[PDB]
Design an enzyme around this catalytic site. Structure first.
Site, PDB file in Angstrom:
ATOM      1  N   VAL A  23       0.827  -1.199   0.000  1.00 20.03           N
ATOM      2  CA  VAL A  23       0.000   0.000   0.000  1.00 20.03           C
ATOM      3  C   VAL A  23       0.863   1.252   0.000  1.00 20.03           C
ATOM      4  O   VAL A  23       0.665   2.157  -0.819  1.00 20.03           O
ATOM      5  CB  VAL A  23      -0.962  -0.019   1.199  1.00 20.03           C
ATOM      6  CG1 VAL A  23      -1.693   1.301   1.308  1.00 20.03           C
ATOM      7  CG2 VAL A  23      -1.958  -1.145   1.054  1.00 20.03           C
ATOM      8  N   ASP A  24       1.833   1.331   0.907  1.00 21.76           N
ATOM      9  CA  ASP A  24       2.633   2.541   1.034  1.00 21.76           C
ATOM     10  C   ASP A  24       3.569   2.766  -0.141  1.00 21.76           C
ATOM     11  O   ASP A  24       4.245   3.799  -0.177  1.00 21.76           O
ATOM     12  CB  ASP A  24       3.446   2.497   2.319  1.00 21.76           C
ATOM     13  CG  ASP A  24       2.590   2.658   3.547  1.00 21.76           C
ATOM     14  OD1 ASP A  24       1.426   3.083   3.408  1.00 21.76           O
ATOM     15  OD2 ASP A  24       3.086   2.365   4.654  1.00 21.76           O
ATOM     16  N   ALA A  25       3.630   1.839  -1.094  1.00 28.08           N
ATOM     17  CA  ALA A  25       4.561   1.989  -2.204  1.00 28.08           C
ATOM     18  C   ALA A  25       4.340   3.310  -2.932  1.00 28.08           C
ATOM     19  O   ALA A  25       5.166   4.226  -2.852  1.00 28.08           O
ATOM     20  CB  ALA A  25       4.407   0.811  -3.163  1.00 28.08           C
ATOM     21  N   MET A  85       4.707   6.593  -0.899  1.00 22.30           N
ATOM     22  CA  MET A  85       6.058   7.037  -0.595  1.00 22.30           C
ATOM     23  C   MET A  85       6.796   7.511  -1.838  1.00 22.30           C
ATOM     24  O   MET A  85       7.669   8.375  -1.729  1.00 22.30           O
ATOM     25  CB  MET A  85       6.834   5.926   0.107  1.00 22.30           C
ATOM     26  CG  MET A  85       6.271   5.575   1.478  1.00 22.30           C
ATOM     27  SD  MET A  85       6.027   7.032   2.524  1.00 22.30           S
ATOM     28  CE  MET A  85       6.767   6.517   4.070  1.00 22.30           C
TER      29      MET A  85
END
Lengths: 67, 266, 77, 52, 52, 77, 77, 77, 76, 77, 77, 77, 77, 77
Positions: free
Chosen positions: N58-60, N63
């Site tokens: 998800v945070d790919a 970020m």
């Protein structure tokens, strides 16, 4: 079609092969066709609709139970 | 009368103020520059309401039977319980002081809100057409002045109970190690917990203020903008509606007061 | 001056947002109420009464913003 | 605007609003208060018969 | 409209009324209610004492 | 000129947001109504009744909004 | 010309927002109609007639906005 | 010119957003309240007490902005 | 002139909003379709029939919007 | 002047947003609390204690945005 | 000239909104797909089949818009 | 002049959106936490441990944006 | 020159929307996935399989967007 | 030159959208994680493993957006 058992603690009330049934389940009237996914529920008193393979309908009166 | 409603609606928002320095009446067209200009109407009406409350309760407290209550004693002891149970179910320290405070809050704020039910022009009309005064609005809670006062009072009462029941050391610990539990972030907690602290009075006042200010403004607008004869079909609904607001905005003030203090002590 | 039309536009903004909020909040609440009605068809009076008790609160701020919108449209402009 | 006519419009609504209050807000108060006097009368009468 | 001196006056009237309620309204009436509750509940003491 | 142009943008935001709000709210309420109906094929009309009750509330603000949009686009235009 | 270019933007929002409205507002609604169908196939006809009833209401206001969206986009240009 | 209208737009923003947030949060909470009520029709008063308990905290921050919006609309404008 | 890119912006607006509406509306619906199917894996055809019967509806206004978007984008 | 009048939009946005984010986030959390209460009505004041505990963490960002939302309007403007 | 600016901007918007649409639509669908599977893995491939037969449709307008967007960003420059 | 005002707006937007994000995320998380606790009160402290553990990951990206909002106003100014 | 500014703004909005879409899309799916896992260990590898299968689709349009954003900001600009 | 403030604004909104997306996605995921915990607590380590696996997905994109925004705020600006 699928195989239906209606049994009481005292005696057995139905068996055999059926096409569909329609059952006033606790959380809302319900209707079962073949392949139906695994399910479990109480039911309210009142009739249940059975249609036997070759479409021969019959009713049964149930005072309650679990489907 | 040379009035466009397009500005009569504006005059109605004007306050009959003083100046401590001049001790005279601040005219609507020019406002004086100072901190020292009492809203005469608010202090005059507010206490004319709260004294009525206190009197109507004391007159019964001076007689209250332990027998069958009068049809009028009945309502008062009814609401005494209505408040008492709301105190009992939520506050679980010892302090005697909570319940009377909450009763005052509930009844007094209820009355203050109740001020606005009456037709908007009726008392201003008296204050000008007969009694020769320049201007008048008659709802205290349509002013930040009353509401921030009460709210800051409750803020001081927080500062009273939070020390009284868990001491300055625990007071500061909460204010330094909640919410993160780690000393490694204390300065952040110091900001968070303090503006949280002030949110309570800020919101407390502004809730009541905004709700009553808007409930008034709708009455003003309905009076002026419409053809008078069509005004009933839109003034009836808003009056009906404002019952619930005048009630709940006071009840909720009371409830949150109890909850904030009880959270302070406990 | 063009000062007028910005005011009309601001009132459009405010009423649009107010209507969104009112419709959605009341819709959620009413849907839950209808579910409860389906379950307890005999209690629909008590539930229908309880529903308004909060339905009056959901449309508080909408009823603020509607008045301000009208004020900016007609009174100010 | 005829300001006096707008104070007319106030009166219609406010006499109309009173007519709703009398028929929908006052009777719930005089019924509950009567219920309260009922409870207190009963809880005294029965208890003092238990005293007998 | 804007921040005034009126806030302080309202704070004074507020605390005045809070005291004037605290002492001479609240205990005066809760004592009444709970004294009635004593005399009502203690009627059961008959069916719990003489009965025994 | 633009006194006679941006008012269409104002009407646009008004009626667009009103449409979104009304559609979403009534969709949610109707979804719960259809689910209740499936579970209770006898109460269909009674639930329909309560639905038409609270549906009127959900659309109250949106209709204010579209009426104002019409006023703007044709009165000030 | 300075006049009419801007109005396409106003049309873009009315006819754009109305899509999100009638789209999601109906998507949710139909979703319950399916759930109801999967439980009670024998009612799949009856439920549909209720679906079309309410489904009119949900897309009423969007149809307003697309209606005007034409009046602005094509007629007034 | 810039003295006036931009502030009205700022207040429109403030109070539109306030309306959205208040209406929607209150709606969610009231929906859960009514559902629980339909499951425990005895506990109406206990539940609605807790409802009023928490519900104030919902309006706590939005009415910050509504108050400050009335400031800008009348403390300045 | 200043007209053209502005009208392409006006088209992009409608296209983006139509896409949002269509994608979310059809997802919210197909999800319930799949859960119904997994409930009664033998009635998949009847449910798919109804699923299209209503999918055709959700795409009405979005398709109108995409059409007018193409129109603006190329007819002017 | 513009270099001062435009800041009222800055504060308007900054906290106008933090309001709805907070009010809804609170509403949701309050929601689950009520459903718990309805299913363990003997356990309420335990849940109400945890509710307030976690409820503090919700406000962390919203409030400091109200801080900066306030500092701007009165200090910067 | 300035035409490049608004065209790159329009591309960004027309593909960002399509991205959000496709992302959340497929996510919603896949949630139900995975849940159905986990309830009874015997059916995984049947659900996967009907899942793709649906997923094709969620992607319709998104990819249409991506086509127009790439056209813009490159062909119209 | 306004060169040093657009930066205030850029701070406002960034911090407001961070507020929405953190508020909603923690609202949802805490809701599920409360219901889990309500069903298994024996586990309250373990649940609360996992709750903070996950909340950590929630607040990180919202927090980075708030710090940058600070920096914009006070560091770059 | 002024081209730079709007090129950066276009890429910015593009990728902000890309982040919204992809994060929410995978969040929903992962939530259902973890619910499945908690229901049914001993399926977990197959759940992870099919989860990744659909996952690959959610990222499609978002990955297009994150490609084109870099194309704008560093290939063009 | 007018150059830097537009880039500041662009990066601001970009990473604000990043904040919203990442926060809410992780909130959803953590909520389902927690209820899965309360259902089968002894699986907490395995659920944690899978939760971190998915969280990594998800945070790919968020970020990546963080990277670009901070870059343009510290490597361009």
């Amino acid at each position: 079609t699928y195989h239906l058992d209606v049994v009481s603690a005292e005696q057995q009330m139905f068996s055999g092969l059926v096409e569909k049934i329609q059952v006033t389940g606790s959380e809302g009237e319900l209707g079962i066709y073949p392949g139906h996914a695994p399910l479990l529920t109480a039911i309210k008193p009142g009739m249940i609709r059975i249609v036997k393979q070759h479409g021969h309908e019959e009713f049964i009166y149930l005072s309650g139970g679990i489907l | 009368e040379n009035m466009t409603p397009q500005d009569y609606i504006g005059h109605h928002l004007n306050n009959l103020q003083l100046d401590l320095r001049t001790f005279s009446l601040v005219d609507p067209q020019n406002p004086p520059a100072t901190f020292w200009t009492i809203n005469i109407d608010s202090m005059f009406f507010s206490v004319v309401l709260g004294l009525l409350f206190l009197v109507l309760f004391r007159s019964v407290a001076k007689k209250a039977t332990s027998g069958v209550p009068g049809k009028f004693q009945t309502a008062i002891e009814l609401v005494i319980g209505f408040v008492n149970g709301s105190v009992k179910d939520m506050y679980h320290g010892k302090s005697k002081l909570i319940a009377p405070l909450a009763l005052t809050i509930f009844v007094w704020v209820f009355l203050m809100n109740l001020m606005d039910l009456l037709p908007i022009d009726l008392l201003p009309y008296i204050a000008e057409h007969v009694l020769g005064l320049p201007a008048l609005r008659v709802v205290p809670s349509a002013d930040v002045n009353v509401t921030l006062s009460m709210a800051l009072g409750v803020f001081i009462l927080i500062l009273f109970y939070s020390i009284k029941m868990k001491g300055i050391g625990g007071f500061t610990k909460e204010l330094t190690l909640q919410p993160f539990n780690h000393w490694a972030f204390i300065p952040v907690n110091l900001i968070l917990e303090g503006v949280s602290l002030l949110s309570k009075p800020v919101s407390l006042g502004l809730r009541l203020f905004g709700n009553m200010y808007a409930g008034e403004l709708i009455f003003i607008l309905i009076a002026g903008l419409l053809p008078w004869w069509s005004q009933w079909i839109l003034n009836v609904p808003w009056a009906i509606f404002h019952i619930l607001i005048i009630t709940l905005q006071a009840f909720i003030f009371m409830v949150l007061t109890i909850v904030y203090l009880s959270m302070a002590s406990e | 001056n063009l000062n007028m039309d910005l005011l009309y536009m601001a009132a459009a903004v405010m009423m649009g947002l107010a209507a969104i909020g009112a419709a959605i909040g009341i819709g959620i609440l009413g849907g839950k109420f209808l579910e409860g009605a389906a379950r307890q068809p005999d209690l629909i009076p008590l539930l229908r009464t309880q529903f308004f008790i909060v339905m009056g609160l959901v449309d508080a701020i909408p009823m603020i913003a509607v008045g301000l919108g009208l004020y900016v449209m007609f009174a100010v402009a | 605007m005829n300001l006096n006519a707008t104070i007319l419009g106030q009166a219609i609504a406010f006499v109309l609003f009173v007519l709703f209050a009398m028929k929908y807000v006052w009777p719930p108060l005089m019924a509950a208060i009567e219920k309260r006097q009922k409870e207190i009368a009963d809880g005294l009468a029965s208890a003092e018969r238990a005293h007998k």
